[PDB]
Write an enzyme that holds these catalytic residues in place. Sequence first.
Site, PDB file in Angstrom:
ATOM      1  N   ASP A  46       0.835  -1.192   0.000  1.00 58.77           N
ATOM      2  CA  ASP A  46       0.000   0.000   0.000  1.00 58.77           C
ATOM      3  C   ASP A  46       0.870   1.241   0.000  1.00 58.77           C
ATOM      4  O   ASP A  46       0.551   2.231   0.672  1.00 58.77           O
ATOM      5  CB  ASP A  46      -0.943   0.006   1.215  1.00 58.77           C
ATOM      6  CG  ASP A  46      -2.084   1.012   1.099  1.00 58.77           C
ATOM      7  OD1 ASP A  46      -2.445   1.437  -0.011  1.00 58.77           O
ATOM      8  OD2 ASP A  46      -2.618   1.396   2.177  1.00 58.77           O
ATOM      9  N   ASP A 101      -3.485  -3.062  -2.047  1.00 59.33           N
ATOM     10  CA  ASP A 101      -4.537  -2.037  -2.122  1.00 59.33           C
ATOM     11  C   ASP A 101      -4.509  -1.307  -3.467  1.00 59.33           C
ATOM     12  O   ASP A 101      -3.496  -1.250  -4.158  1.00 59.33           O
ATOM     13  CB  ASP A 101      -4.344  -1.037  -0.975  1.00 59.33           C
ATOM     14  CG  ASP A 101      -5.556  -0.128  -0.761  1.00 59.33           C
ATOM     15  OD1 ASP A 101      -6.668  -0.531  -1.131  1.00 59.33           O
ATOM     16  OD2 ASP A 101      -5.371   0.993  -0.229  1.00 59.33           O
ATOM     17  N   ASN A 102      -5.628  -0.693  -3.806  1.00 56.73           N
ATOM     18  CA  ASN A 102      -5.716   0.246  -4.913  1.00 56.73           C
ATOM     19  C   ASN A 102      -5.417  -0.282  -6.299  1.00 56.73           C
ATOM     20  O   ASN A 102      -4.884   0.384  -7.087  1.00 56.73           O
ATOM     21  CB  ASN A 102      -4.730   1.372  -4.603  1.00 56.73           C
ATOM     22  CG  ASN A 102      -5.003   2.074  -3.322  1.00 56.73           C
ATOM     23  OD1 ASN A 102      -4.163   2.118  -2.457  1.00 56.73           O
ATOM     24  ND2 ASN A 102      -6.150   2.678  -3.239  1.00 56.73           N
ATOM     25  N   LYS A 140       2.285   3.335  -6.041  1.00 56.48           N
ATOM     26  CA  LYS A 140       1.815   2.198  -6.825  1.00 56.48           C
ATOM     27  C   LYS A 140       2.867   1.710  -7.808  1.00 56.48           C
ATOM     28  O   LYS A 140       2.831   0.529  -8.185  1.00 56.48           O
ATOM     29  CB  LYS A 140       0.512   2.556  -7.556  1.00 56.48           C
ATOM     30  CG  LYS A 140      -0.593   3.073  -6.596  1.00 56.48           C
ATOM     31  CD  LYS A 140      -0.725   2.258  -5.302  1.00 56.48           C
ATOM     32  CE  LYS A 140      -1.412   3.066  -4.167  1.00 56.48           C
ATOM     33  NZ  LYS A 140      -1.170   2.532  -2.807  1.00 56.48           N
ATOM     34  N   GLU A 146     -11.406   4.438  -0.155  1.00 58.81           N
ATOM     35  CA  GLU A 146     -11.673   4.960   1.176  1.00 58.81           C
ATOM     36  C   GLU A 146     -12.422   6.288   1.124  1.00 58.81           C
ATOM     37  O   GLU A 146     -12.057   7.213   0.388  1.00 58.81           O
ATOM     38  CB  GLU A 146     -10.361   5.114   1.945  1.00 58.81           C
ATOM     39  CG  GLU A 146      -9.316   5.943   1.163  1.00 58.81           C
ATOM     40  CD  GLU A 146      -8.291   5.085   0.452  1.00 58.81           C
ATOM     41  OE1 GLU A 146      -8.666   4.013  -0.106  1.00 58.81           O
ATOM     42  OE2 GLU A 146      -7.095   5.487   0.442  1.00 58.81           O
TER      43      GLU A 146
HETATM   44  C1  LIG Z   1      -1.487   4.972   1.100  1.00 59.53           C
HETATM   45  S1  LIG Z   1      -0.303   5.574   2.264  1.00 59.53           S
HETATM   46  C2  LIG Z   1      -0.324   4.094   3.315  1.00 59.53           C
HETATM   47  C3  LIG Z   1      -1.665   3.982   4.039  1.00 59.53           C
HETATM   48  C4  LIG Z   1      -1.717   2.874   5.089  1.00 59.53           C
HETATM   49  N1  LIG Z   1      -1.322   1.554   4.573  1.00 59.53           N
HETATM   50  C5  LIG Z   1      -3.124   2.797   5.648  1.00 59.53           C
HETATM   51  O1  LIG Z   1      -3.986   2.193   5.017  1.00 59.53           O
HETATM   52  O2  LIG Z   1      -3.377   3.338   6.722  1.00 59.53           O
HETATM   53  C6  LIG Z   1       1.214   5.262   1.287  1.00 59.53           C
HETATM   54  C7  LIG Z   1       2.501   5.433   2.098  1.00 59.53           C
HETATM   55  O3  LIG Z   1       3.631   4.833   1.462  1.00 59.53           O
HETATM   56  C8  LIG Z   1       4.801   5.606   1.772  1.00 59.53           C
HETATM   57  N2  LIG Z   1       5.783   5.212   0.770  1.00 59.53           N
HETATM   58  C9  LIG Z   1       5.737   5.441  -0.574  1.00 59.53           C
HETATM   59  N3  LIG Z   1       6.782   4.783  -1.125  1.00 59.53           N
HETATM   60  C10 LIG Z   1       7.450   4.113  -0.157  1.00 59.53           C
HETATM   61  C11 LIG Z   1       8.569   3.305  -0.184  1.00 59.53           C
HETATM   62  N4  LIG Z   1       9.216   3.051  -1.336  1.00 59.53           N
HETATM   63  N5  LIG Z   1       8.990   2.765   1.014  1.00 59.53           N
HETATM   64  C12 LIG Z   1       8.359   3.024   2.211  1.00 59.53           C
HETATM   65  N6  LIG Z   1       7.263   3.846   2.213  1.00 59.53           N
HETATM   66  C13 LIG Z   1       6.812   4.358   1.036  1.00 59.53           C
HETATM   67  C14 LIG Z   1       4.297   7.031   1.732  1.00 59.53           C
HETATM   68  O4  LIG Z   1       5.185   7.893   2.410  1.00 59.53           O
HETATM   69  C15 LIG Z   1       2.911   6.884   2.340  1.00 59.53           C
HETATM   70  O5  LIG Z   1       2.898   7.120   3.743  1.00 59.53           O
HETATM   71  C1  LIG Z   2      -3.001   9.739  -5.249  1.00 54.11           C
HETATM   72  C2  LIG Z   2      -3.907   9.865  -4.101  1.00 54.11           C
HETATM   73  O1  LIG Z   2      -3.577  10.441  -3.140  1.00 54.11           O
HETATM   74  C3  LIG Z   2      -5.275   9.243  -4.225  1.00 54.11           C
HETATM   75  C4  LIG Z   2      -5.625   8.095  -3.733  1.00 54.11           C
HETATM   76  C5  LIG Z   2      -4.824   7.067  -3.000  1.00 54.11           C
HETATM   77  C6  LIG Z   2      -5.501   6.107  -2.289  1.00 54.11           C
HETATM   78  C7  LIG Z   2      -4.823   5.150  -1.606  1.00 54.11           C
HETATM   79  O2  LIG Z   2      -5.453   4.192  -0.903  1.00 54.11           O
HETATM   80  C8  LIG Z   2      -3.466   5.134  -1.649  1.00 54.11           C
HETATM   81  O3  LIG Z   2      -2.794   4.179  -0.993  1.00 54.11           O
HETATM   82  C9  LIG Z   2      -2.789   6.072  -2.350  1.00 54.11           C
HETATM   83  N1  LIG Z   2      -1.345   6.130  -2.398  1.00 54.11           N
HETATM   84  O4  LIG Z   2      -0.804   7.006  -3.236  1.00 54.11           O
HETATM   85  O5  LIG Z   2      -0.676   5.504  -1.806  1.00 54.11           O
HETATM   86  C10 LIG Z   2      -3.481   7.048  -3.023  1.00 54.11           C
HETATM   87  C11 LIG Z   2      -6.282  10.097  -4.913  1.00 54.11           C
HETATM   88  C12 LIG Z   2      -7.666   9.600  -5.060  1.00 54.11           C
HETATM   89  O6  LIG Z   2      -5.961  11.115  -5.313  1.00 54.11           O
HETATM   90 MG   LIG Z   3      -4.153   2.614  -0.379  1.00 57.81          MG
END
Ligand SMILES: C[S@@+](CC[C@H](N)C(=O)[O-])C[C@H]1O[C@@H](n2cnc3c(N)ncnc32)[C@H](O)[C@@H]1O
Ligand SMILES: CC(=O)C(=Cc1cc(O)c(O)c([N+](=O)[O-])c1)C(C)=O
Ligand SMILES: [Mg+2]
Length: 213
Positions: A139, A167-168, A142, A197
């Site tokens: 997650d 996810d996603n 992507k 979400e």
């Molecule tokens: C969608 S948020 C995670 C949400 C969390 N899993 C939740 O559902 O509560 C994506 C996170 O991945 C982190 N991230 C992105 N690339 C990463 C990487 N290569 N290694 C570790 N963290 C990374 C970002 O800083 C961000 O906090």
């Molecule tokens: C790029 C972004 O912020 C958006 C959704 C999103 C939802 C996720 O659940 C998620 O994990 C991540 N992510 O970048 O990691 C992103 C939207 C709708 O703009």
């Molecule tokens: Mg996500």
Amino acid sequence: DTKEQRILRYVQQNAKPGDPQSVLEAIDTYCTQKEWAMNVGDAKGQIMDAVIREYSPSLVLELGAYCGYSAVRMARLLQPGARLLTMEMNPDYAAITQQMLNFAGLQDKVTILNGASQDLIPQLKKKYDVDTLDMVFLDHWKDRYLPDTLLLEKCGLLRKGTVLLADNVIVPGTPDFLAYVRGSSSFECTHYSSYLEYMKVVDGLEKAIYQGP
Ligand SMILES: C[S@@+](CC[C@H](N)C(=O)[O-])C[C@H]1O[C@@H](n2cnc3c(N)ncnc32)[C@H](O)[C@@H]1O
Ligand SMILES: CC(=O)C(=Cc1cc(O)c(O)c([N+](=O)[O-])c1)C(C)=O
Ligand SMILES: [Mg+2]
């Protein structure tokens, strides 16, 4: 302050310490009513709950912690002595995640690793005493899902039956990862249709179970 600080403050003021369910409910209320945020959320979280309960994994790796919502979600369902490792490269977010886990009373089950997954995954066996993983929740950004899946394989961290839960795979989408695992005899895949979400937007999780090399 930041949105992530506001989410944490809302939890601290609207949940009960040591009560993970109330922490999840507080985050979902705040992010429904006040500020959208990229937590996996309750609809997809319920699918994750069902997967975690089915497999009862002893060692879970999460890629991407953000504010700690999914770490709380998974850690609250882990059996005694099971553990969650979560990798988070943004130090502001890693600090929020630690405080969220502390508030929920789950910190003894979770280890936060502050760094990039591509740098940390190669260190899991030697530095963090990992043999193989039972389950991986992908997650993070992507474009890393496929490179890190291949890296976990290279590093010997996947065994027959390791569950990858991504996810996603619809929004934002992970087209190379999805095409690769669905086309590969090394993974048995299942798609779980759901909703982004906090929004009425179709999304989904992909479960890809590793079959060996
Ligand atoms: C969608 S948020 C995670 C949400 C969390 N899993 C939740 O559902 O509560 C994506 C996170 O991945 C982190 N991230 C992105 N690339 C990463 C990487 N290569 N290694 C570790 N963290 C990374 C970002 O800083 C961000 O906090
Ligand atoms: C790029 C972004 O912020 C958006 C959704 C999103 C939802 C996720 O659940 C998620 O994990 C991540 N992510 O970048 O990691 C992103 C939207 C709708 O703009
Ligand atoms: Mg996500």
